Design a protein around this ligand. Structure first.
Ligand SMILES: *[C@@H]1O[C@H](CO)[C@@H](O[C@@H]2O[C@H](CO)[C@@H](O[C@@H]3O[C@H](CO)[C@@H](O)[C@H](O)[C@@H]3O)[C@H](O)[C@H]2NC(C)=O)[C@H](O)[C@H]1NC(C)=O
Ligand SMILES: *[C@@H]1O[C@H](CO)[C@@H](O[C@@H]2O[C@H](CO)[C@@H](O)[C@H](O)[C@H]2NC(C)=O)[C@H](O)[C@H]1NC(C)=O
Ligand SMILES: *[C@@H]1O[C@H](CO)[C@@H](O[C@@H]2O[C@H](CO)[C@@H](O)[C@H](O)[C@H]2NC(C)=O)[C@H](O)[C@H]1NC(C)=O
Ligand SMILES: *[C@@H]1O[C@H](CO)[C@@H](O[C@@H]2O[C@H](CO)[C@@H](O)[C@H](O)[C@H]2NC(C)=O)[C@H](O)[C@H]1NC(C)=O
Ligand SMILES: *[C@@H]1O[C@H](CO)[C@@H](O)[C@H](O)[C@H]1NC(C)=O
Ligand SMILES: *[C@@H]1O[C@H](CO)[C@@H](O)[C@H](O)[C@H]1NC(C)=O
Ligand SMILES: *[C@@H]1O[C@H](CO)[C@@H](O)[C@H](O)[C@H]1NC(C)=O
Lengths: 201, 596
């Protein structure tokens, strides 16, 4: 063994542009050797929480595929991304199952996303009829209804647009600074395992 | 789904989009204030009205929800703020006239000028000058001249403007389901929610003079002592029976008696406490002052302040053409942004002002988690009291010696303590009767108890028993004396300053009790006590979410506003004054006048 076909983590953590939270990007990783030590041994990550397995032991066992979900949220909303949590993000945008196994990484990106006049590209859902199922993505832009009369399109009294934008500014304090979040999930279907670390020698 | 869910959805939609617009308006205001230029003027306006242009529609939309069926107290309280018709209830042709009359009144007050008749080509303004003449001078004739001139060239044209202003504002008051404008002002001290904590608007009237009567024995002795000292200063001008005139106090309106400290110093052989030269010797800059003002709050237990406050705040000395108006302020721009603005210098006064603004910033940071419409103090009197507590507690000799400014071998004695106590009393307790009398007169004039003719005589007769001030020269009906005041011509409520003192003293007494201190209250300190910090934080974090009666239950043990801590603070001074004026008699005669 010579350790080849490295998994492309650079294309995920160092992507030029990220997607909105209501349209989070999902990437499938398989059939490659992955090195999580280079990720864990980095001081650039503000939050690194592993639930299913301990980070050090992760280099031994291996699965049949991995899924990376990437998006951008606010600073105060990182705590909502965890099993058994509630909130706007955890209900209408991104929900994790209670039996989740994997890891969550979140780092500040104030110097990139924020703009002097205000960055309004990122959006999120504010209203929804019912809570989301785990790993379910909803991108519909139907006009919301809260009252009793049905509204034909245009916003009325109780008819609001379900999507609202973010107002990132250079000077907002750590509470409101943008944060980039990547969630790694390991899935272990009946197919033979293919994604695990180098045979050290 | 009832209307209660619709209200929640509407509020959730509203506050999210209100936050950004408010932040933009605050940013524009800060940009103008830090950098005074024409280019940065219109921008403020271009934001300002727009913010208002957004606040009106949401106020218009908060009427289809019938706020009598909503059961959640928080939601109802949050919605009550939006349902304020304000001046929109008046007709447009009257609203424009009201705006015009306020603008012209403000301009007239701000453009006062007096020329000495010998030199009619050089008038002075209320800026340093005439005010300096009235404050720092020793001459009866020129003081009387300045007083009469200012009340005769500003107090004459304001009578019809104020006459129309009163009736127009009163019609607005009936338009807003109030029988008087006094009720509109007193509405902030009103709660009708939790049982046992209810407080009505009318109760404040009976509650003010109930707690004012206990202060009269303390005020009478001060009046007698000041009158005796003025007699020993001014010969054959102040009778020992009557009360002192208006223009000898040391201020244009007599709001404060600080300027009189030079004449009425008890025994000035020993020097006063000053460490400014010590600060200069140790080479203290603005950073050192603002870091020593932060270590105190850290030691108490309050959280450390965020990064970026040191980067964005204009701490000191704009310097060149980059000018700035730097009345000391603490700015809460929203979205987790806090700043300060000051032209700091190396002086103990700037040290105390820095502590005051630091307390303001801490209180602002305390309730950042509340919704947008609940980010304020419980009432208008809590914020300044919280600010002034730190100033009171950061000037004791023990705290000064702890940070090593005073000499470690300093011994205090009778006279310096008594002198400092009297110096503080000349400012704190010497202004309560003036505020009480002014607010009482304004309440009655809005209620219409005194008719139009009974204006200038009722004011001056009441001032005699309430305050103890006589007429220098009579005014019959053609003057408007109260109009020559900032808080009377600019439409500002004046009852805040009366409650601020009692609130601050109650808070200080409660903290010192729960800080394990022994001795007189005025020497107490709240440093290195984490339980006191926790006790204060438990109330600071509430914001406007709870009634102020409940807020006055975690710091102190009684919801009512009493005066016992005030009397307990000035106990040594009172017991010295008891034996001080053993030959004179306390109290004044209301009939003696300088002219007749
Ligand atoms: C995303 O891009 C950043 C920036 O390049 C990557 O961080 C950087 O990664 C390189 C190598 O991957 C590190 O270089 C190191 O240099 C020292 C000598 O100075 C050498 O001894 C090490 O073995 C290593 O080669 C570099 O320190 C590191 N950080 C910075 C600030 O450049 C990052 O790895 C990329 N993301 C992913 C998932 O790879
Ligand atoms: C009014 O509504 C608010 C928000 O729905 C309620 O606040 C909740 O209070 C409970 C009390 O323990 C907390 O556990 C929740 O976290 C709070 N927020 C939410 C979203 O539920 C408040 O209690 C309500 N007031 C009432 C019912 O009197
Ligand atoms: C604020 O002004 C509105 C507009 O007039 C008032 O709403 C009216 O109130 C009267 C009686 O109070 C009703 O007969 C009307 O049907 C109401 N009209 C609308 C469009 O609601 C409101 O009462 C005023 N006071 C508030 C909101 O406190
Ligand atoms: C706020 O104050 C706290 C308490 O002093 C700071 O925490 C420590 O501060 C010292 C010196 O300021 C540092 O040497 C330590 O490394 C800090 N420890 C930790 C865990 O932070 C804190 O850094 C201060 N924060 C700011 C922004 O000034
Ligand atoms: C193994 O990989 C290294 C990587 O630098 C390469 O130099 C070497 O030639 C490779 N050898 C074999 C047998 O694949
Ligand atoms: C102040 O405003 C003027 C007007 O545009 C501008 O030229 C100058 O750069 C500003 N100064 C600062 C420090 O922002
Ligand atoms: C302080 O007061 C006490 C009691 O009157 C007196 O005995 C003492 O001499 C006084 N000390 C000074 C320095 O005045």
């Amino acid at each position: 063994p010579n350790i080849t076909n490295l998994c492309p983590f650079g294309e995920v953590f160092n992507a030029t542009r990220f997607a909105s939270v209501y349209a989070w990007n999902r990437k499938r990783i398989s059939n490659c050797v992955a090195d999580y030590s280079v990720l864990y041994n980095s001081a650039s990550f503000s939050t690194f929480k592993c639930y299913g397995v301990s980070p050090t032991k992760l280099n031994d066992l291996c699965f049949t595929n991995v899924y990376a979900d990437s998006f951008v949220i606010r600073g105060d909303e990182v705590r909502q991304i965890a099993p058994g949590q509630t909130g706007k993000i955890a209900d209408y945008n991104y929900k994790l199952p209670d039996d989740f196994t994997g890891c969550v990484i979140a780092w500040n990106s104030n110097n990139l996303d924020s703009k002097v006049g205000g960055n309004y590209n990122y959006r999120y859902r504010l209203f929804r009829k019912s809570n989301l199922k785990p790993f379910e993505r909803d991108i519909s832009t139907e006009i919301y209804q809260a009252g009793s009369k049905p509204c034909n399109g245009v916003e009325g009294f109780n008819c609001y647009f379900p999507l609202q934008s973010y107002g990132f500014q250079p000077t907002n304090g750590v509470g409101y600074q943008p944060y980039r979040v990547v969630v790694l999930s390991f899935e272990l279907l009946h197919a033979p395992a293919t994604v695990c670390g180098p045979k050290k020698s | 789904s009832t209307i209660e869910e619709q209200a929640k959805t509407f509020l959730d939609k509203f506050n999210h989009e209100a936050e950004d617009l408010f932040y933009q308006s605050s940013l524009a205001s800060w940009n103008y204030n830090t950098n005074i230029t024409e280019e940065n003027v219109q921008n403020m306006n271009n934001a300002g009205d727009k913010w208002s242009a957004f606040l009106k529609e949401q106020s218009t939309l908060a009427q289809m929800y019938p706020l009598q069926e909503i059961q959640n107290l928080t939601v109802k309280l949050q919605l009550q703020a939006l349902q304020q018709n304000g001046s929109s209830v008046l007709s447009e042709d009257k609203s424009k006239r009201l705006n015009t009359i306020l603008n012209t009144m403000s301009t007239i007050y701000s453009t006062g000028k007096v020329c000495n008749p010998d030199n009619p080509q050089e008038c002075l303004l209320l800026e340093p000058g005439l005010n300096e003449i009235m404050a720092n001078s020793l001459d009866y004739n020129e003081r009387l001249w300045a007083w009469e001139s200012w009340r005769s060239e500003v107090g004459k044209q304001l009578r019809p403007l104020y006459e129309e202003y009163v009736v127009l504002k009163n019609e607005m008051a009936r338009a807003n389901h109030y029988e008087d404008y006094g009720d509109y002002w007193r509405g902030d001290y009103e709660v009708n929610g939790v049982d046992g904590y209810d407080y009505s608007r009318g109760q404040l009237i009976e509650d003010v003079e109930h707690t004012f009567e206990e202060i009269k024995p303390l005020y009478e002795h001060l009046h007698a002592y000041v009158r005796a000292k003025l007699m020993n200063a001014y010969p054959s001008y102040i009778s020992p029976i009557g009360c002192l005139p208006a223009h000898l106090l040391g201020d244009m309106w007599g709001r404060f008696w600080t300027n009189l400290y030079s004449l009425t110093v008890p025994f000035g052989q020993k020097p006063n406490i000053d460490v400014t030269d010590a600060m200069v010797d140790q080479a203290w800059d603005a950073q050192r002052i603002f870091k020593e003002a932060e270590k105190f709050f850290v030691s108490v237990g309050l959280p450390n302040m965020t990064q970026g406050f040191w980067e964005n705040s204009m701490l000191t000395d704009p310097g060149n053409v980059q000018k700035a108006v730097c009345h000391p302020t603490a700015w809460d721009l929203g979205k987790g942004d806090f700043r300060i603005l000051m032209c700091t210098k190396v002086t103990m006064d700037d040290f105390l002002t820095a502590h005051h603004e630091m307390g303001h910033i801490q209180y602002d940071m305390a309730y950042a988690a509340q919704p947008f419409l609940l980010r304020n103090g419980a009432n208008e009197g809590f914020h300044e009291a919280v600010g002034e507590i730190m100033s009171l507690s950061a000037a004791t000799p023990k705290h000064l010696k702890s940070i090593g400014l005073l000499s470690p071998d300093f011994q205090e004695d009778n006279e310096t303590e008594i002198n400092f106590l009297l110096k503080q009393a000349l400012t704190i307790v010497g202004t309560l009767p003036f505020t009480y009398m002014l607010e009482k007169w304004r309440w009655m004039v809005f209620k219409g108890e005194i008719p139009k003719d009974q204006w200038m005589k009722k004011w001056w007769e009441m001032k005699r028993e309430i305050v103890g001030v006589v007429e220098p020269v009579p005014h019959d009906e053609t003057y408007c004396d109260p109009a020559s005041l900032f808080h009377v011509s600019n439409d500002y409520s004046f009852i805040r300053y009366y409650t601020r003192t009692l609130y601050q003293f109650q808070f200080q007494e409660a903290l010192c009790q729960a800080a394990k201190h022994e001795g007189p209250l005025h020497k107490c300190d709240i440093s290195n006590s984490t339980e006191a910090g926790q006790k204060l934080f438990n109330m600071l974090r509430l914001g406007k979410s709870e009634p102020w009666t409940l807020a006055l239950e975690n710091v102190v043990g009684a919801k009512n506003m009493n005066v016992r801590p005030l009397l307990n603070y000035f106990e040594p001074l009172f017991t010295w004054l008891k034996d001080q004026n053993k030959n004179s008699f306390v109290g004044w005669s209301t009939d003696w006048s300088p002219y007749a």
